[PDB]
Design an enzyme around this catalytic site. Structure first.
Site, short mmCIF file in Angstrom:
data_model
loop_
_atom_site.label_atom_id
_atom_site.label_comp_id
_atom_site.label_asym_id
_atom_site.label_seq_id
_atom_site.Cartn_x
_atom_site.Cartn_y
_atom_site.Cartn_z
N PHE A 81 -20.33 -61.32 -44.06
CA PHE A 81 -21.52 -62.01 -43.55
C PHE A 81 -22.17 -62.87 -44.62
CE2 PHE A 81 -24.49 -61.16 -39.77
CZ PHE A 81 -25.09 -62.40 -39.89
N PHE A 82 -22.30 -62.34 -45.84
CA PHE A 82 -22.87 -63.13 -46.93
C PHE A 82 -22.00 -64.35 -47.24
CE2 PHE A 82 -25.40 -59.28 -48.06
CZ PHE A 82 -26.65 -59.90 -48.17
N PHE A 184 -30.88 -63.42 -38.96
CA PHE A 184 -30.78 -62.22 -39.77
C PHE A 184 -29.89 -61.16 -39.12
CE2 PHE A 184 -32.15 -58.34 -41.97
CZ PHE A 184 -32.15 -58.77 -43.29
N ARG A 324 -27.64 -62.57 -56.25
CA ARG A 324 -27.70 -63.63 -55.25
C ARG A 324 -28.99 -64.44 -55.33
NH1 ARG A 324 -25.07 -65.07 -50.52
NH2 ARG A 324 -26.45 -66.08 -48.98
N1 LIG Z 1 -28.68 -63.00 -43.95
C1 LIG Z 1 -28.21 -62.98 -45.31
C2 LIG Z 1 -28.42 -64.32 -46.00
C3 LIG Z 1 -29.90 -64.52 -46.33
O1 LIG Z 1 -30.65 -63.36 -46.13
P1 LIG Z 1 -30.12 -65.18 -48.05
O2 LIG Z 1 -31.59 -65.34 -48.34
O3 LIG Z 1 -29.42 -66.51 -48.14
O4 LIG Z 1 -29.51 -64.20 -49.06
P2 LIG Z 1 -30.55 -65.74 -45.10
O5 LIG Z 1 -31.99 -66.06 -45.51
O6 LIG Z 1 -29.64 -66.94 -45.11
O7 LIG Z 1 -30.47 -65.02 -43.77
MG LIG Z 2 -28.91 -67.98 -46.79
#
Ligand SMILES: NCCC(O)(P(=O)(O)O)P(=O)(O)O
Ligand SMILES: [Mg+2]
Ligand SMILES: [Mg+2]
Ligand SMILES: [Mg+2]
EC number: 4.2.3.37
Length: 340
Positions: A81-82, A184, A324
């Site tokens: 997912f990431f 999310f 991250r």
């Molecule tokens: N859902 C994981 C990715 C995130 O949480 P991230 O802030 O990019 O780590 P997003 O804001 O894109 O939803």
């Molecule tokens: Mg993101």
């Protein structure tokens, strides 16, 4: 161990003590190897960054009590997912509307028939299919169909985000809060509570108002705290989807004011959760009516609500541990070193 004051939540630190699943050491390496063997990241970036991204830690602090092989599947999916969030971001930045469109259709198809896609040419699609096929093996097909229904919706929310960012549209506050429950993947993490406790919950149980509201608040905290913590990186990356950005854009707030309003909304999730958690645990107690099935249902709801609570502490410490979000340590603040 020391959280920046603007991000610090004393109630989490005092009242939501961290838990860690005992399988986490083997989880960490097994997912790292999976990322390697599925070619979801370059081998150089895996060796340098995978562990420091803390993706498996995040799941191991969340789905407590999960069978080892369930947690492994969840952690692989969560890492996927990431990476998918990274590919989505790169397709947007490089205007690859056709590549994104094709990936989106392939994910929709693979979601319904993951086995047919286990060796697809696109390694991102193949890795998706492998994790999803494994998740589909734990609980009856009625749970698999609910997971897919939920994730079809997630894919389409990513497509909406694609349209917003290429067109430079910042969603309205209420529009964003609605969209955020899908980007999310609130309801995917909620679904995955049930294989972790070994039980597909009947609709009447999981739609009980206390269960639903506890499940909602857990994910709202996770998403909005991410918004609070990922705000620097996301502003740096020309990301538009973030509660703070919607507040600055449409409510004419400053950056300090928007951070304070997000922080307040995050804090309210916690104390709202504490109140409804009592009702959800009373519900679990009522399910134990004396029958065998009632005890199992009661145990499974208790486990799930327990993990709804664990999500708070896992997400909190994850945002202060994971590489991250350390935008200040990158040579290019708009290009995180771990994306291709
Ligand atoms: N859902 C994981 C990715 C995130 O949480 P991230 O802030 O990019 O780590 P997003 O804001 O894109 O939803
Ligand atoms: Mg993101
Ligand atoms: Mg995203
Ligand atoms: Mg974010």
């Amino acid at each position: 161990i020391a959280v920046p004051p603007s991000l610090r939540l004393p109630v989490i630190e005092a009242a939501f003590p961290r838990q860690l699943h005992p399988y986490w050491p083997k989880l960490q390496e097994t997912t790292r190897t999976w990322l390697l063997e599925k070619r979801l990241m370059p081998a150089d970036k895996v060796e340098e960054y995978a562990d420091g991204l803390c993706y498996t830690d995040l799941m191991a602090g969340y789905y407590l009590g999960a069978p080892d092989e369930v947690l492994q599947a969840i952690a692989d999916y969560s890492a996927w997912f990431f990476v998918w969030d990274d590919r989505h971001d790169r397709d947007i930045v490089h205007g690859r509307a056709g590549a994104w469109r094709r990936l989106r259709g392939l994910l929709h198809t693979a979601l319904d028939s993951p086995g047919d896609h286990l060796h697809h040419e696109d390694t991102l699609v193949a890795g998706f299919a492998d994790s999803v096929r494994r998740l589909y093996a734990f609980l009856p097909a009625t749970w698999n169909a609910r997971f897919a229904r939920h994730f079809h919706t997630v894919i389409e929310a990513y497509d909406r985000e694609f349209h917003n960012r290429t067109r430079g549209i910042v969603p309205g506050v209420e529009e964003y809060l609605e969209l955020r429950r899908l980007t999310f993947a609130h309801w995917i993490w909620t679904d995955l509570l049930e294989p972790s406790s070994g039980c597909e919950l009947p609709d009447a149980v999981r739609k009980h108002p206390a269960y639903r509201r506890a499940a909602l608040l857990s994910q709202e905290f996770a998403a909005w705290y991410n918004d609070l913590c990922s705000l620097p990186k996301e502003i740096a990356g020309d990301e538009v989807h973030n509660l703070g950005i919607s507040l600055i854009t449409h409510h004419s707030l400053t950056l300090e004011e928007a951070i304070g309003e997000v922080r307040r909304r995050v804090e309210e999730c916690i104390t709202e959760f504490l109140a409804v958690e009592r009702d959800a645990l009373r519900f679990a107690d009522e399910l134990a009516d004396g029958t065998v099935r009632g005890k199992e249902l009661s145990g499974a709801v208790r486990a799930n609500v327990g993990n709804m609570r664990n999500w708070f502490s896992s997400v909190y410490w994850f945002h202060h541990e994971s590489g991250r979000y350390m935008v200040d340590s990158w040579d290019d603040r708009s290009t995180p070193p771990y994306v291709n």
